[PDB]
Amino acid sequence: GRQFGHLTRVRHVITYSLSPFEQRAFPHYFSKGIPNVLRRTRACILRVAPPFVAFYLVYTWGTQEFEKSKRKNPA
Amino acid sequence: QLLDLAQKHFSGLSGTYDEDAVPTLSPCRFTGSQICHREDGLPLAHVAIAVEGPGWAHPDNVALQVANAIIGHYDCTYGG
């Protein structure tokens, strides 16, 4: 296991933090969040959606081919 | 002798004074915040941590100073 003060060497990086009591928990929750969430979705839809569509259509065809098979039409 | 000298040398700021603009100090907001300058090439860390104090005038600077005296100060060359 590792602890602070032994992790790695870092030089020249200032970090400015604020107390939680001085700031608001939801700065711009809907005015920034919604722009972000669509942006996040658009970033991944072409990478996550296409196999699920491909599954869905195999599922819907497969089940439709299941029932429309055991019933006859001639003698 | 000092007042004599003060009138002798400083008197020369009379005539007219403050007739266009006067500046009085505005209060300064204290923010509970952090600044961390990370430099792993200096051999010792310096950390200064503080709450907001009351200001010069406040009678309770005395009790603060007493509490500060109790905690005090240390340095590696102290013999105690």
Whose tokens are 């004599």? That residue is B4
Read off the tokens for B33: 């915040």
- The partner residue sitting opposite B38, judged by closest CB among A10, A16, A22, is A10
For B49, phi then psi, to 5°, come to: -125, 130
Domain A1-75: give its CATH code: 1.20.5.210
Please, are residues B32 and A21 in contact by the beta-carbon 8 Å criterion?
yes
Q: How far apart are CA B61 and CA B55, in angstroms?
A: 8
Please, are residues B31 and A18 in contact by the beta-carbon 8 Å criterion?
yes
Query: Which residues, in sequence order, are CB contacts of A14 under 8 Å at separation 6+?
Result: B35, B36, B37, B38
* B-chain residue closest to A18, CA distance: B33
Render B21-74 in DSSP notation, one character per residue: ----PPP-----EEEEEEETTSSS------PPP--TT-TTHHHHHHHHHHH---
Structure's resolution in angstroms: 2.7
What sign does the CA torsion over A36, A38, A40, A43 have?
A: negative
**Cβ contact (<8 Å) for A18 and B36?**
no
Per-residue burial over B42-80, b = 16 or more CB atoms within 10 Å of its CB, e = otherwise = eeeeeeeeeeeeeeeeeeeeeeeeeeeeeeeeeeeeeee
Method: X-ray
Radius of gyration of chain A (CA): 27
Query: Residue A15 forms beta bridges with which residues?
Result: B36
**Cβ contact (<8 Å) for B33 and A12?**
no
Query: Which residues, in sequence order, are CB contacts of A23 under 8 Å at separation 6+?
Result: none
Read off the tokens for B36: 């961390």
What torsion do the CA atoms of B11, B16, B18, B21 make, to the nearest 10 degrees? -140
